[PDB]
Amino acid sequence: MRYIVALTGGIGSGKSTVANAFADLGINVIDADIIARQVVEPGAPALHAIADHFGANMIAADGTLQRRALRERIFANPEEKNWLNALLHPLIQQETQHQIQQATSPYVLWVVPLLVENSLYKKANRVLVVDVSPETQLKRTMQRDDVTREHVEQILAAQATREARLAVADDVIDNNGAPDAIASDVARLHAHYLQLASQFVSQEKP
Amino acid sequence: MRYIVALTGGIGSGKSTVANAFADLGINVIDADIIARQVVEPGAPALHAPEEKNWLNALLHPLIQQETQHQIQQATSPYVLWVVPLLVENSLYKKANRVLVVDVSPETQLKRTMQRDDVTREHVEQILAAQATREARLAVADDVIDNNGAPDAIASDVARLHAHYLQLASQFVSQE
Amino acid sequence: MRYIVALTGGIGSGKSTVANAFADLGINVIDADIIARQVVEPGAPALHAIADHFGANMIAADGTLQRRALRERIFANPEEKNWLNALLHPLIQQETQHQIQQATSPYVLWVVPLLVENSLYKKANRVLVVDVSPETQLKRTMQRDDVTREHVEQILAAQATREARLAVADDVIDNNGAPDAIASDVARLHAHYLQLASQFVSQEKP
């Protein structure tokens, strides 16, 4: 078995910065967003199911998914969102499980943007939340995208609140910094996680 | 952005008594029930457009989402009080910055509901059986306000809470 | 109104051993899996509805449900599973409520294997988790069924983690050993649950 530490945070919290810091210590990172992309790659069962359901025009000349087309085709039929999700849900679960089993690091870091929203913390052994102020989320996202404060605040309104995330966190790491202290903070967490992972299979009492 | 304090409680907890005390202090109250009705009003978009309930959900949820969001942006108070009867049941606390639970004994829930709605004790117990439990609400509460007594007895707690919420609302966006 | 103490635990935690210990102390045990069986017993309208929907072969010559036959008809088939849940979920809810209402013990022990997975703890006044190490879950499951360690890890991955259960538990009882080892803990919990049951209806403050 593999010890699973789930990492989550809101838009603009810099989850990648924290994940890369754990990757630097030899931890394998399994990213929910990458897995979702991997399950619709050429050859994947989901791709054929998608073409069969939405039609051949969802497939590009090279056989890959026309994501933009499908993305806009869903918006034009939210009911379709459900069929798609019901299709991909099982596949993402199986591919995620596969990649976790394949990781050889002491424990794995599973990055899940929607950890709180979809209650996926129930599938984690430990929950780490990358925390930052709402201003930081707004600032960074804008500087990385567009439409000033609006648009983004529309995103923050659609995600779980800062407080909702802290409510389910076992550990919290601040990323308002530079990250001047992320390397240090990550090192401390790593030490604890190595300990938790080496004893979790046989530990008789919590 | 606007700070959201969610208010919830079981049937007979007197949620309105508490919400009106905040309303009197100048806080805009956004009522989930009021909004649910507004979404299905005369000439509403929803009207123009087992099982069938789910189809009806994919329709009413987004609209309810947008309307709630609209009332929150037009509110003029430092923070808003979002009254959500099914906060625990529907996990809507994940959308709140703070959770206030109006708490009472099951005895109070029974006595008040039977009185106000003139119904049997076995009838209200059925309702209590269908809503989250007292302890389930307490598990997600940031703040708890006892409402077992008369309306005037909550004054002290409302004043402490309102001052705390004003402070949280003023600092939350930049709070490191 | 009866006080409801929900009991849960992962596969191999020996949930029924704990439940039986409380039953021996005079507590009415309300088991979700037993309730599901009761609602499809001979004479129940749900049984006839199942035969009408899936076929007469769903019923045995002695009038009882052919359990594996039904499972085979819903396995893989999402629509048939949905249909069966739509039929049974309400009946199970009603029967459970009914048996809780008629129980004679001050508090009941509601045994729910999927308590955390399905957020059913929201309907309990107290949550008792039967806790065991993952190692215990693996060994017991491997001995019970003719399965491999990996087969069991797949099951474990489909259930909430040990930590997720502990996060919502009010009380925890260790069941890594033999049945007698829990007698003392069950007696202590029992005494406390009678106290909570005696005060909960009129308790003014939490």
Curated annotation (Swiss-Prot), chains A, C:
State the pathway, as annotated in the record: Cofactor biosynthesis; coenzyme A biosynthesis; CoA from (R)-pantothenate: step 5/5
Name its GO BP terms in alphabetical order: coenzyme A biosynthetic process
Against Pfam families, the record matches this protein to: CoaE
Q: State the similarity comment.
A: Belongs to the CoaE family.
DPCK domain span: 4-200
- Relay the pH-dependence remark from the record: Optimum pH is 8.5.
Q: Which domain of life is it from?
A: Bacteria
Source organism per entry reads: Escherichia coli (strain K12)
Q: What does this protein do?
A: Catalyzes the phosphorylation of the 3'-hydroxyl group of dephosphocoenzyme A to form coenzyme A.
Subunit notes for this chain?
Monomer. Forms homotrimers in the presence of sulfate. The trimeric form exists in solution in equilibrium with the monomeric form.
Where is the protein found, in the record's own terms?
Cytoplasm
Where is this protein chiefly located? cytoplasm
Q: Does the keyword Nucleotide-binding apply?
A: yes
Name this polypeptide is given: Dephospho-CoA kinase
PROSITE patterns (UniProt xref):
DPCK (PS51219)
Output the PANTHER family linked to this UniProt entry. BIFUNCTIONAL COENZYME A SYNTHASE-RELATED, DEPHOSPHO-COA KINASE-RELATED
GN (gene name): coaE
Q: Which UniProt keywords apply?
A: ATP-binding, Coenzyme A biosynthesis, Cytoplasm, Kinase, Nucleotide-binding, Transferase
Binding, ATP: 12-17, 144, 175-177
Q: Which reaction does it catalyse?
A: 3'-dephospho-CoA + ATP = ADP + CoA + H(+)
Q: Which CDD domains match?
A: DPCK
Q: What are the top taxonomic ranks of the organism?
A: Bacteria, Pseudomonadati, Pseudomonadota, Gammaproteobacteria, Enterobacterales
- Which EC numbers characterise this protein's activity in its record? 2.7.1.24
Q: Which GO terms describe its molecular function?
A: ATP binding; dephospho-CoA kinase activity
A cellular component annotation (GO) from this entry: cytoplasm
Q: Does the keyword Ligase apply?
A: no
UniProtKB/Swiss-Prot annotation, chain B:
**Annotated binding of ATP, by residue:** 12-17, 116, 147-149
Which Pfam families does the annotation name? CoaE (PF01121)
At the top level, the lineage of the source is Bacteria
- Substrates-to-products reaction catalysed: 3'-dephospho-CoA + ATP = ADP + CoA + H(+)
Please name the GO terms of the biological process aspect recorded for this protein, alphabetically. Answer: coenzyme A biosynthetic process
Query: In the UniProt record, does the keyword Zinc occur?
Result: no
Asked if the Swiss-Prot or TrEMBL record annotates the protein with the keyword Transferase, the reply is yes
**PANTHER family per record:** BIFUNCTIONAL COENZYME A SYNTHASE-RELATED (PTHR10695:SF46), DEPHOSPHO-COA KINASE-RELATED (PTHR10695)
- Subunit structure, briefly? Monomer. Forms homotrimers in the presence of sulfate. The trimeric form exists in solution in equilibrium with the monomeric form.
Mind telling me what this protein is named? Dephospho-CoA kinase
Q: Organism, per UniProt? A: Escherichia coli (strain K12)
Q: What is the lineage of its organism?
A: Bacteria, Pseudomonadati, Pseudomonadota, Gammaproteobacteria, Enterobacterales
Query: Which gene produces this protein?
Result: coaE
